[PDB]
């Protein structure tokens, strides 16, 4: 007698939100915000370098923990909390800027700068940088006077970047636990270090005095750095309290740097990383870590945003 027509439905459909209504039940919906996580660093197919107890900046100066990282090469660079940039207590001026440089460097290639010395000491060491007992930073030279209190002869050294790429140059400045031990190394009187180039132009002076016994020392080393252009030339005018750069550093290519405390996994592939692991998703958004790096979904505040993929659900 008649013919009827209609649509499908379900006893239990999912609630979504529209421009005009909240909690409208539809047939089939889907999640749009990623919350699922992988508690590992998915590094399948990538040249990875887990620094462990080596600090990123340490790969340039060369404390004991970084001896296996002095010329590393990577697509992915992982920093660990236990990593240390230093053996003898000290810091990097503009450390974060330098860290950010090294994270996308793709690794580093070292090259000797070629500095020879006329009548001073070089093999300066300490019980902090220990290998076979007292030693020093692998890439650095502890410049001293021949023996206690001897004069430090105002020297002048120089390096020229003979390569197509800019060179990372790093020197140090010694700050002694007292003006007493300062003289024991370089003698008394004002000591001055000046560094210049095309780009760069600045200078440095030591500041002896008693600091807390960190790592078994009251003294500190101030590491500094500049970015030397091709053909340009570095000049170190100094007379003590100076830590000489043996080798200059050159960037390899491209990479990414992350920070994490989870184990590395070469089984899974990922592009979006954060400190608690890897976010693998096709979803456009994520509610996990706002500081995630790499190729990531957009971080959003909402834990969930459901996208309707079915029609309106009118039940029986």
């Amino acid at each position: 007698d008649k013919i009827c027509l209609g649509h499908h439905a379900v006893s239990n459909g999912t609630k979504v939100n529209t421009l005009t209504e909240r909690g409208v039940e539809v047939v089939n919906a889907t999640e749009t915000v990623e919350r699922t996580n992988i508690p590992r660093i998915c590094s399948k197919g990538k040249r990875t370098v887990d620094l462990g107890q080596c600090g990123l900046l340490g790969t340039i100066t060369g404390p004991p923990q970084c001896d296996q990282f002095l010329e590393f090469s990577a697509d992915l660079i992982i920093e660990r909390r236990e990593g240390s940039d230093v053996c003898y207590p000290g810091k990097f001026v503009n450390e974060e800027a330098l860290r950010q440089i090294l994270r996308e460097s793709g690794g580093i290639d070292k090259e000797a700068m070629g500095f020879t010395y006329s009548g001073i000491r070089t093999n300066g060491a300490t019980s902090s940088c220990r290998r076979s007992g007292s030693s020093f930073y692998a890439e650095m030279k502890w410049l001293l006077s021949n023996t206690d209190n001897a004069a430090f002869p105002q020297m002048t050294k120089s390096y020229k970047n003979t390569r197509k790429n800019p060179a990372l140059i790093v020197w140090g400045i010694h700050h002694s636990g007292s003006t007493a031990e300062q003289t024991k190394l370089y003698g008394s009187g004002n000591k001055l270090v000046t560094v210049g180039s095309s780009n760069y132009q600045q200078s440095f002076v030591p500041s002896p005095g008693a600091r807390t016994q960190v790592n078994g020392q009251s003294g500190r080393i101030d590491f500094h750095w500049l970015m030397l252009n091709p053909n340009d030339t570095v000049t170190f005018s100094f007379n003590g309290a100076f830590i000489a750069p043996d080798r200059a550093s050159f960037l390899r290519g491209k990479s990414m740097g992350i920070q994490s405390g989870v184990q590395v996994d070469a089984d899974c592939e990922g592009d979006c990383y954060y400190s608690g692991g890897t976010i693998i998703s096709n979803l456009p958004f994520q509610n996990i870590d706002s500081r995630a790096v790499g190729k990531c979904p957009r971080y959003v505040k909402q834990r969930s945003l459901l996208l309707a993929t079915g029609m309106k659900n009118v039940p029986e």
Binding site: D1, K2, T18, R81, K312
Partner: protein
């Protein structure tokens, strides 16, 4: 809905219809029937599919660190960074909320439309041999067996053949 069909005069949908999205349910001489319309169903499905693929999206844009979780950067620069990040979080949280709400509204109104497209098309086939009940059914004013029903479903039904008989039932 905008098209007045789904949750409109069609008071509800058929949970028995596990066959497809839309379909015909008839009652005639032989009894009752219920089969799904692949054609209109696939159109809706192909459209919802289109949204999913265009939304599931990879930005080949790589972002690296500017913060530091192990060694906090200077407070001033640390605050500008946090300030910026939060501001952008606000934007994307907003965009995401709207985007989904906007799409969902459209998804619904699209399905409602696809139904109305089918109804208004059958009515065009029958022309004069039937009349609208109101709640989405065509009362046939002529005898229509099961093979007569199938003539409509595969879009072949001829109104001329049963024109005189059905018009007579005024």
């Amino acid at each position: 809905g905008l098209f007045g069909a789904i949750a409109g005069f069609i008071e509800n949908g058929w949970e028995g219809l596990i066959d497809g999205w839309y379909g015909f349910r008839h009652q005639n001489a032989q009894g009752e029937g219920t089969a799904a319309d692949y054609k209109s169903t696939q159109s809706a499905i192909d459209q919802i599919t289109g949204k999913l693929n265009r939304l599931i999206e990879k930005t080949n844009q790589q972002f690296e660190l500017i913060d530091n979780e192990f060694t906090e950067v200077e407070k001033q620069i640390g605050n500008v960074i946090n300030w910026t990040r939060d501001s952008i979080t606000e934007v994307w949280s907003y965009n995401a909320e709207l985007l989904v709400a906007m799409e969902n509204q459209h998804t619904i109104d699209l399905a409602d439309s696809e139904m109305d497209k089918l109804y208004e098309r059958v009515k065009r086939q029958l022309r004069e041999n039937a009349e609208e009940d109101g709640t989405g059914c065509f009362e046939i004013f002529h005898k229509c067996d099961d093979d007569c029903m199938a003539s409509i479903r595969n879009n072949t039904y001829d109104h001329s053949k049963y024109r005189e008989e059905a018009m007579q039932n005024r």
